[PDB]
Amino acid sequence: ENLEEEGLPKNPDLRIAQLRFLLSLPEHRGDAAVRDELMAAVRDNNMAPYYEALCKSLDWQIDVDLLNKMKKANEDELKRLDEELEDAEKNLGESEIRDAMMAKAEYLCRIGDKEGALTAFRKTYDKTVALGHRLDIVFYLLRIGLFYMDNDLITRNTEKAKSLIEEGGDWDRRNRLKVYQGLYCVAIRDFKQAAELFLDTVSTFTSYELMDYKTFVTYTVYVSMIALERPDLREKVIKGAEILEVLHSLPAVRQYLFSLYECRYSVFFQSLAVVEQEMKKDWLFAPHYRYYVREMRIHAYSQLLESYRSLTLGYMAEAFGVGVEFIDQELSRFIAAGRLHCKIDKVNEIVETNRPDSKNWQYQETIKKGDLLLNRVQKLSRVINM
Amino acid sequence: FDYKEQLPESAYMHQLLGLNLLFLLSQNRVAEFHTELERLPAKDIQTNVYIKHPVSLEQYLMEGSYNKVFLAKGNIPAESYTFFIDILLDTIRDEIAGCIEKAYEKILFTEATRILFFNTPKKMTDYAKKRGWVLGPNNYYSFASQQQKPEDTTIPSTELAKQVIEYARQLEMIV
Amino acid sequence: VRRAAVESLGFILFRTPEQCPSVVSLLSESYNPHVRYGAAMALGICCAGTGNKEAINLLEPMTNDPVN
Amino acid sequence: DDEFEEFPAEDWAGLDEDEDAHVWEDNWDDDNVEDDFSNQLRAELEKHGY
Amino acid sequence: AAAEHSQRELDTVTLEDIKEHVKQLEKAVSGKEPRFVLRALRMLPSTSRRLNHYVLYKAVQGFFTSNNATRDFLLPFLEEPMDTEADLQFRPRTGKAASTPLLPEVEAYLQLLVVIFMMNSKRYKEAQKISDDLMQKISTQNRRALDLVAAKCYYYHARVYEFLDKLDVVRSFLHARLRTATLRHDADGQATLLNLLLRNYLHYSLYDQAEKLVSKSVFPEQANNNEWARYLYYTGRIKAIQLEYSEARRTMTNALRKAPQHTAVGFKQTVHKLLIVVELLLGEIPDRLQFRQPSLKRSLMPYFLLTQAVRTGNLAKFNQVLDQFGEKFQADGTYTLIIRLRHNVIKTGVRMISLSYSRISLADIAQKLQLDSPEDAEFIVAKAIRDGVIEASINHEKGYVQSKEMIDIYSTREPQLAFHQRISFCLDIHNMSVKAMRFPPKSYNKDLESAEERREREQQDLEFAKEMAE
Amino acid sequence: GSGLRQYYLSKIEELQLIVNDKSQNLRRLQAQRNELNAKVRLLREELQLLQEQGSYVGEVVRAMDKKKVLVKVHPEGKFVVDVDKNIDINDVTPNCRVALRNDSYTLHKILPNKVDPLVSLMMVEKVPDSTYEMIGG
Amino acid sequence: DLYSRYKKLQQELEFLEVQEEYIKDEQKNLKKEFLHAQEEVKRIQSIPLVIGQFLEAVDQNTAIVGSTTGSNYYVRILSTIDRELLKPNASVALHKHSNALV
Amino acid sequence: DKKFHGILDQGEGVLIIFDEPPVDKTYEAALETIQNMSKVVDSLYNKAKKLT
Amino acid sequence: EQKMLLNLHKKSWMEGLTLQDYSEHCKHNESVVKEMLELAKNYNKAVEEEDKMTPEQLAIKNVGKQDPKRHLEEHVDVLMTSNIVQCLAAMLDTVVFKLI
C-alpha cells in the first residue's frame, strides 16, 4: 500500500511532460480534460517559467492575473529560500547549507525553471558530502533530462550515476538507474537494451515517479515482444510470475502478448492496431510508433514463415484476417527491405521461404557500420588538417 | 545563342535545335546530347514540341520503352525530323534483339514480329542469319548463351596476389 | 672508411667554405664517434684559414664530446 | 575564413523548436507516407464483410 | 548622439584593425614569406562588414600619404565626413615612410576594401571602374606575394560583374590572367581563376566549354580548401550533366567534406541538392540524416519528396513530385537532371520486383510500376535483364518473369572487392596521418649526457679505480 | 630596354619555387633523422648509465647549517650528508624521502613523500567511513 | 648579376637534392643501428642478477626498489623494460653491481 | 522454439532437417569492435575539437 | 664464411609456400579479434582519462597498468601480418600447384 511513497521525489512530474506532448499532438490539442489537468498541475506547483513556455510554444492566451499571482508566489518562495540559505551559511552547518540549496533547486525544478534548476543542482552537488545525496541529485538531473528529452544531460548523468553506484554498492539505486536507462533506451529506439533492463527490474521496480507499475509492465512487454527471441520471450515474459500477475489486470496486453506467442495472428494484428494507437499517444513511444509496429508485423510474418517451407498467399491472408492483396503488398515491401527470407510466386501465389546464411547478414552489417566509422574517421581527419 | 541579344528569336530555331538533338540521339552521342540540351532554357524543354519530342525519345530509349521509340516516328514535330528517325531505328532493332538474347531464353518465331517490329516474315530470316540465331524446329529461337557466366570457376589469384602485395607495400614501404 | 669519407668532403668543398657547415653539420652529431671526428676534420680542412663562424660554432660543442 | 558568399544562401526559414533533435539508426522506411496500421486493418476488416 | 559616439568607437578600432593588416602585409614583404598575407585575408570577410564611408575615407587619406592618381581616383568615389570634433590624424606613415610610395601589396588591399564597400553600397558601375583600375595595377606588377592577394581581387573583380550580369567581358580577362598565373606557377591565383572561369561557364550553361577547360587545365594540388570545394562542386556538376555520375558523386562528396564546417550554408545547400540528385541518378539512396539538418530541411524538402518517390520506385509518385516542384527544380538548376530520374525510378521498381517475386506476371509488373501496358513492361524488363539490373528471365508465351535464384554473395569475390576498397582507403588514411606528423625543430642531442655531469663520473670512477684496487 | 631579363627572372623564380619546396622537405627529413639519431645515441649511452651505482633511499631527520642534512639510510642508521647544488635546502623538510649518492651519500633528489604516519596508522585501524545519510534514528 | 644568381640557385637546388638523398640513406642505416643498440643494451641483463621488489615509480626512467639484500635503492629502469609489468609488489631483477632495474 | 533446425513441407508432408552452421564469432567480435572503436573516435572528436 | 654463416635460421623453401592450418588460423583470428574488443572498450576509457590527466602522470600512471593502445597496435600488426601472409601464400599456391 506504501508503493508510491517508496519512489523518488516527483520533480519534474513526468505526467506534465506527457500532457504537454498530448497537447502538441494535432488530434488532442483541444482536449479540455488534458488542458484542465495540465493547468491544475501548473497552478498547484506555480510553474511560471513553464506557463510562459506553454503559452509561447502552444500559442495560448496567458491569464495575466494567474501569471502574476504565480510569479509573486515564486518570487516570495525564492526570497524565503534565499533567506534560509543566508541564515545557514552564517549560523548553521554545512549540512543545513546543502539542505537549503537542495530546497532551492527542488523549487526551481518544480516550477519548470530548467536552466536555473541545473545551475542550482550543480552548485548543490559541488558541496554535497554524502554519496547517496549526490546520487539523488544525479537522479534529479536524469529526471530533468527525461522531462525535456535532453540527450546530452541524460547521457552525462547516466554515466555519472553508473560511476556513483559503482563507488557505493547501492543496489536499490542500481535498479532505479536501470529503470531510468530503460526509459531512455525506449526514447531512443534501443528496444534491445530497454527490454534487458526492464526484465532485470521487473521484480525490483520502485520508480513510481516515472510511471505506474502497470505502465512499467506494459512497456516491458511491448519492448520484449520486439527485442526478444521466442525462447527468451517464453522463459522471461510468458512464464514470468510477476509479469503474468500484472497481466491478470491487463487483459489487452496479455491478449497482445499471447496472440503472438500462441500464433493467433488475426488476434495479434487487432491487438497490434490497439497497441499502435496506444504508442501514438505515449511521449516515449511516439517517435517509434511507426517503427515498432512495422517491426512487429515483420516478426509475425517471419514467425508464420519460420516453420514452413512454403505457404499459399490465401493461407497467410486467412491467418492474419486480411486480404490477399494486403499480404502481397506487405510481404513484397518487407522482402525488398531484406527483412523477410522468402520470395513470392505471384503466378501461383506461393511464398517460398529461404535460409540465407548468417555470414551474409553479418557481412552487410560489417560493411554498413565500417562505412559509418570510416566516415567518422575521414571527417575527423578533415577537422584535424585545418 | 551568341548574337541573340541583337538578333530576334528565329521561328525555325527551336525546330532546328530539336533536329540537332535528334541527330545526336541517332549517332549515340548521348553525352553530347545532354550538354547541348542544357543550353536551352528549362521551360521550352518541357513546353516546346520541337524540343519535347527528342528528349522524350531519349527517355524512352534509356528506360527501354522501345515500342514508344518506334511510335515516335508517327508523331514527329516536323517533316525534317523524319530522316534522323530512321538512323535511330536501325539501332533500336539491333538493341532489341540484344535484350531478347539475354532476357528471353526462348521465343517463338512470330512472337518477335511485334518485338522486333518487322513487317514481313521474310525480313526475319535475313536479320536472323545476320544475327546468327539458331532457329528451332518448333519455330523457337533458342538463346541458350548464359552458360558464359562471369566465370567464377576461375580464381583471379594473380589480381588477388597483387592486391595483397600492395597491402604489404603500404604497410612496410612507408618507411 | 666512414671517417675518411666525411674527411674527404673538405677537400671537395674548400672552394666554397660556406657549404661545409651545412652538409656536415648533421654528421657532427651522429651516433658514430668516427663520423663525428670526420665531420670535425672536414670543417677544419674546408674552412681552414677562413675563420668561418658557422664552422667554429659547430666545433665548439664538439670539444666537449664524450669520446676523446 | 573565405566563406562562400558567392553562392546564394537560400533563407533558412526552419523550425528552431527542436524539430527532430534525435540520435537513432534512422532509416528511410519510417518516412514512407501511409496511414496508420490501425486504419489499414480497420479498412480491410470490413472489406471481407466482417 | 549616442549612435554617433558608438559608430566612431567602432570606426577607430576598425581603422586599427586595417592598420594591423597592412602591417602584416608589409612584414610579409619584408620577411619574404607570402603566407603572412593569408592572415591579412583571413580576417578580410569580417572587416568587409566592419567598415563604412568614414572608415574608408580615413583609411584612404591617411594610408596613402601620397596624393598620386590613386588618391585622385578613389577619394571622389566615397563620401567625406564633416569637421569632426575628434580629428585624430590617422597617419601610420611618418618621415621617410610617408614620402616613400606604398607597396603594391597594400594599395591593392585598400582598393579591394573600397571595391567591397562599393559592392555593399550597390554602386556596381563605380565598383566596376575601381576594379578595372585595380586589375590594371595588379596586371602591371610581377610580385610573388601579390598573387596571394591577386587571386582575391579576381574573385571580387568577377563578383562586381556578377551584379552587372554581364560575365562575358570578364571571360577574356579571366583567361588571360589564368594563363599569366599558370606560366608563373601561381597556385592560389590559378585555382581562383579556374574556379571563376568554371562559374562563368556554368552561368551560361556552357557545359561543353567548362568540360574542355577542366580536361586540359590542371588544378593546383596545393590550393586552398575553400577553392578546392568550389572546384570539386563545378567539376561534379560538369560530370553530372555529362552523365559521368560516379565521378560526379565522388567530387560532390569531397566538396561537402572540404566545405567550411560552420559557414557557407548556401554552398552546402546547393551541393547537397546536386549530390542528392546525382546519388538518385546513380541508383543509390541519399543519406536521410542530411534532410534532418535545421538549415537544409526547408531547402531539401522538395528533394526529400523526390527521394521518397524515387525510392518507392513508382512512376505516378515521381510524376506527381515533378508536376508539383518542376518550377522549384528549374529555379535550382537541377530540372534537367531530375528528368533523367524516370529511368532510375523504373530501374529501382524493377529491382524490388525481382528481389521480392520469384515469378511475377508482366501485367502485375506494369501495375506495380504504373506503366502503360504489359507490352511496354516486356521491353523494360528485357532491357533491365540485359543491362544486368536484375538476374531473371522472361517467358513470353506464359507472360511472366522468373527471377534467378539468389547466389551466395559471401562465396564470391564481391566481399573481397568491397573489403579491398575499404582496406586501401584505411591504409591511405594511416599513411596520410603519419605524413602529417610534424616534429618541431628542437635542439636535439641535448637530452643526452651533459659534459660537466659526465666528467663527474670520470673523476669519481678514477678515484674508485685508484682506491679500491689499492 | 631589357633583353632576356624577363627570361632570367622566369628561370630564377622557377628554380626558387623548387628550391623552397626541397628546402622545406629537407628540413622535415632532417628533423626525422635527428630524432632517430638522438634515440640511438641515448640508447647507447643508457648502457653506460645503467652501470652507474644506484642511490640510497633515506629519510630526512632535519636540515642543518652549511647545507647539511641528517638522514637515515634504510638499513644503515644515520648520516650527515651534503646537499647537491641543484637541490634547495628549503625543500628538504623533515621526514622527507631523499636519494643519496652511492659514495658521497650526497642528497641529490627529493623522492615522493612516503605515507603519512597518521594515514598509515588509520589504514591499520581501518574505521569504516560514514556520513549522516547512513545513520538511522 | 642575373646569370650568377640563376647559376647559384641551380647549384643550391642540386646540393639540396644531394642532401636529401644523404639524409634518406642515413635514416635507412640509423634504423639498423637502432636495432643493434637495442640488441646490445641487453648485456646489462646478463646473470647473475640480484632480486628486488618494485616499490615505487618515481618517474619514467627511475624507480625505488627494495633489494633482497635488505636495502632500498633509487635506481634507473632499463628503457626496454615493459612498464606494464611494473605492478606494486612485483619481483624484479636488478643489476648485481648498480642495482638498476634490468 | 528453435529446438532443432528444419522446415515443414505441408504439400508433401515432409520434415526437412537442416545442418545449420554455427554463427561466426569472428564477425560478431568484429562488429562489436567496430562499435567500440566508433566510441573511441567520438572521444577523439571531443579531444580534437576542444584542444584546437 | 659470411655467406656460410648467413644460412643460420635460413628457412627451407618448403615452409615458404607452406600454408598454416586453417582451423588454427581461424581460431587465432577469432581470439585476437575478441581481444581487440576488450582492448577498444578500454581504449575509449584511456582516451577520456588522458584528456583530464596532468603531464606528470603521462608515464607514471602508465606504470603497472596495461596500455590499450599498445596492445591494440600489437594485435593489429599480428593479425595484418598473419592474414596477409596466409592469403598471399594461398593465392600463390592456387597458381603454382594447378592440375591443368
Side-chain angles (χ1 to χ4, degrees), chain A residues 238-252:
Chain A
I238 290 291
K239 269 138 56 55
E242 305 95 11
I243 305 195
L244 281 197
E245 185 36 66
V246 184
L247 286 189
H248 269 335
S249 74
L250 316 157

Side-chain angles (χ1 to χ4, degrees), chain E residues 156-331:
Chain E
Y156 286 105
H157 180 55
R159 192 76 195 288
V160 310
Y161 286 85
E162 196 99 333
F163 299 114
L164 279 305
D165 304 28
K166 336 276 288 184
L167 257 298
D168 299 332
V169 290
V170 195
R171 183 174 287 116
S172 175
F173 179 84
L174 284 196
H175 266 278
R177 303 330 305 294
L178 194 133
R179 260 293 91 77
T180 206
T182 290
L183 294 189
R184 212 171 262 87
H185 303 285
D186 174 20
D188 264 40
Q190 183 201 332
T192 300
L193 286 162
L194 204 50
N195 283 350
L196 287 170
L197 262 189
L198 292 196
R199 159 177 208 76
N200 181 18
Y201 280 139
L202 302 199
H203 189 278
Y204 292 83
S205 311
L206 293 158
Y207 291 99
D208 185 22
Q209 217 58 225
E211 180 262 347
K212 295 293 187 60
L213 175 59
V214 307
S215 153
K216 335 296 298 184
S217 65
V218 169
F219 197 73
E221 184 78 12
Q222 63 302 24
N224 193 9
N225 274 14
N226 298 158
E227 289 318 309
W228 258 114
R230 309 162 195 270
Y231 181 67
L232 289 165
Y233 161 76
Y234 292 134
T235 36
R237 170 154 270 269
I238 266 69
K239 296 298 206 310
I241 302 280
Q242 300 245 351
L243 311 164
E244 277 142 77
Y245 294 144
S246 162
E247 327 83 305
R249 181 174 86 95
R250 170 176 47 84
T251 47
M252 311 231 66
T253 318
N254 268 48
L256 264 206
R257 208 178 299 116
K258 306 190 89 85
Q261 339 186 156
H262 305 304
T263 169
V265 158
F267 171 73
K268 295 173 170 309
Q269 299 183 8
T270 287
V271 175
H272 266 283
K273 286 180 196 163
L274 202 42
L275 180 53
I276 288 158
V277 179
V278 170
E279 285 211 343
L280 290 161
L281 277 165
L282 246 182
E284 298 188 12
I285 202 82
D287 167 44
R288 181 57 171 86
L289 180 272
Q290 81 208 273
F291 302 89
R292 200 161 321 277
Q293 300 299 333
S295 40
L296 312 181
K297 155 136 198 163
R298 180 75 69 102
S299 55
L300 302 185
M301 205 32 70
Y303 293 78
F304 173 77
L305 267 68
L306 168 94
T307 297
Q308 219 173 331
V310 174
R311 189 185 49 97
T312 56
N314 189 312
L315 206 151
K317 279 152 197 314
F318 174 71
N319 283 10
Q320 179 268 307
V321 154
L322 251 179
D323 302 3
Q324 185 179 5
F325 298 122
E327 300 185 344
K328 184 68 211 316
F329 292 148
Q330 284 166 325

Side-chain angles (χ1 to χ4, degrees), chain D:
Chain D
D1 53 346
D2 309 328
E3 76 75 353
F4 290 53
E5 84 152 40
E6 148 208 0
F7 274 119
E10 169 164 353
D11 76 41
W12 287 40
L15 296 322
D16 294 332
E17 52 251 34
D18 291 86
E19 34 190 4
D20 265 326
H22 63 70
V23 48
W24 321 315
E25 57 267 354
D26 64 331
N27 57 305
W28 278 98
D29 325 287
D30 325 304
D31 301 319
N32 173 12
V33 72
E34 34 167 32
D35 50 336
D36 314 276
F37 175 62
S38 325
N39 296 330
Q40 299 187 353
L41 191 66
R42 186 209 316 320
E44 217 145 7
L45 193 69
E46 82 189 6
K47 234 153 67 168
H48 302 83
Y50 302 136

Side-chain angles (χ1 to χ4, degrees), chain A residues 86-329:
Chain A
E86 285 172 353
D87 164 272
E89 42 161 41
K90 296 179 177 186
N91 320 49
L92 308 181
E94 46 88 55
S95 211
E96 297 86 343
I97 293 167
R98 183 219 156 273
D99 293 0
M101 319 217 260
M102 252 312 263
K104 180 181 169 193
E106 284 169 338
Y107 191 74
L108 287 176
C109 175
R110 190 186 329 268
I111 64 166
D113 199 339
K114 183 210 187 195
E115 290 309 312
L118 297 192
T119 282
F121 272 124
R122 153 170 51 76
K123 293 165 166 172
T124 316
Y125 184 97
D126 266 42
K127 56 224 283 211
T128 291
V129 200
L131 176 67
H133 288 351
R134 270 179 291 153
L135 213 181
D136 291 350
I137 291 173
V138 171
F139 269 126
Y140 253 107
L141 295 180
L142 268 173
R143 218 165 322 126
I144 294 171
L146 282 167
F147 193 77
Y148 300 95
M149 258 320 312
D150 193 359
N151 299 299
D152 299 330
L153 198 56
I154 273 155
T155 291
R156 221 205 332 278
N157 296 135
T158 302
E159 268 324 289
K160 220 165 37 190
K162 283 229 282 314
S163 302
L164 295 182
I165 295 171
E166 272 329 300
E167 280 176 23
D170 209 311
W171 246 114
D172 162 355
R173 297 280 106 102
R174 189 159 334 179
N175 293 317
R176 316 192 105 96
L177 178 68
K178 286 179 158 186
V179 175
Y180 277 77
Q181 223 164 350
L183 248 63
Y184 181 59
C185 290
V186 157
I188 61 167
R189 211 176 271 187
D190 192 5
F191 292 140
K192 298 266 190 168
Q193 191 176 346
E196 166 198 333
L197 297 163
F198 279 179
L199 291 164
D200 286 6
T201 52
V202 80
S203 62
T204 68
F205 177 81
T206 48
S207 308
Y208 298 97
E209 79 274 5
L210 295 185
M211 63 211 333
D212 164 3
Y213 186 47
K214 293 192 184 179
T215 315
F216 168 81
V217 165
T218 56
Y219 281 29
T220 293
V221 170
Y222 287 174
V223 295
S224 304
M225 326 189 33
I226 201 193
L228 282 191
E229 311 276 340
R230 172 123 173 151
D232 266 351
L233 185 76
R234 176 213 343 151
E235 298 301 322
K236 286 155 147 105
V237 187
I238 290 291
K239 269 138 56 55
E242 305 95 11
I243 305 195
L244 281 197
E245 185 36 66
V246 184
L247 286 189
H248 269 335
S249 74
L250 316 157
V253 183
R254 190 206 159 82
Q255 207 213 31
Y256 167 53
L257 162 71
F258 276 82
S259 53
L260 178 75
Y261 184 69
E262 297 166 352
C263 308
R264 293 178 288 149
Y265 294 117
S266 48
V267 180
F268 171 75
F269 257 28
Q270 282 141 45
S271 293
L272 190 51
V274 165
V275 162
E276 176 189 43
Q277 287 317 301
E278 268 194 23
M279 322 233 76
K280 199 175 182 187
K281 280 172 335 205
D282 274 29
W283 68 284
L284 272 200
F285 284 106
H288 331 292
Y289 95 98
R290 274 296 185 78
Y291 162 85
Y292 176 91
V293 164
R294 181 182 60 240
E295 292 297 317
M296 284 321 323
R297 278 204 258 111
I298 292 177
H299 277 224
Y301 295 145
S302 160
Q303 185 168 281
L304 187 42
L305 294 158
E306 155 146 47
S307 39
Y308 298 127
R309 175 196 202 274
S310 76
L311 290 182
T312 63
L313 275 191
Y315 177 76
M316 300 224 50
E318 169 197 4
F320 281 102
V322 285
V324 152
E325 331 90 318
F326 180 79
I327 286 288
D328 162 55
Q329 306 207 340

Side-chain angles (χ1 to χ4, degrees), chain G residues 5-48:
Chain G
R5 286 189 29 218
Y6 153 71
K7 294 303 289 185
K8 206 252 287 194
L9 223 45
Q10 225 173 4
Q11 305 273 3
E12 180 176 2
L13 161 68
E14 166 190 87
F15 191 63
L16 283 166
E17 149 209 343
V18 162
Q19 262 178 298
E20 95 178 359
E21 198 167 350
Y22 134 81
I23 284 290
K24 286 209 284 281
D25 224 0
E26 200 184 7
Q27 272 172 18
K28 190 196 319 295
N29 294 96
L30 271 166
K31 290 192 180 105
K32 332 209 325 198
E33 260 294 325
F34 180 69
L35 284 210
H36 287 327
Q38 254 184 321
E39 195 40 59
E40 99 181 21
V41 81
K42 290 213 277 195
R43 84 172 271 195
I44 205 69
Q45 304 178 325
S46 57
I47 66 201

Side-chain angles (χ1 to χ4, degrees), chain B residues 27-97:
Chain B
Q27 317 299 319
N28 206 17
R29 291 168 18 179
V30 47
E32 311 189 24
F33 165 86
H34 284 100
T35 59
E36 297 280 1
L37 167 90
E38 253 285 349
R39 305 257 298 131
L40 272 310
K43 169 55 62 186
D44 44 54
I45 297 178
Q46 79 169 1
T47 286
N48 195 286
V49 45
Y50 300 107
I51 301 315
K52 180 176 184 176
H53 179 278
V55 62
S56 305
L57 190 52
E58 206 282 322
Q59 309 171 206
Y60 302 149
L61 182 43
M62 224 208 276
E63 84 187 13
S65 287
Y66 291 118
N67 51 344
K68 291 191 172 183
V69 161
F70 272 97
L71 294 169
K73 187 157 194 169
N75 52 333
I76 33 66
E79 188 41 54
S80 319
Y81 287 70
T82 292
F83 167 51
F84 300 144
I85 282 313
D86 322 67
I87 313 170
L88 201 31
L89 286 209
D90 328 295
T91 322
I92 304 299
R93 220 161 253 101
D94 229 311
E95 280 286 348
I96 285 181

Side-chain angles (χ1 to χ4, degrees), chain I residues 53-98:
Chain I
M53 179 177 89
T54 88
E56 284 95 7
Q57 286 153 316
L58 297 183
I60 302 176
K61 211 163 182 51
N62 203 8
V63 161
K65 264 95 90 169
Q66 90 159 12
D67 188 8
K69 187 144 149 296
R70 202 203 86 191
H71 291 281
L72 220 34
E73 274 163 20
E74 281 162 356
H75 285 43
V76 159
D77 154 26
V78 157
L79 279 198
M80 290 232 72
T81 296
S82 183
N83 295 291
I84 280 185
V85 168
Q86 185 88 0
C87 284
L88 187 49
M91 263 99 77
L92 301 201
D93 288 352
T94 45
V95 173
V96 171
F97 312 101
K98 79 204 326 283

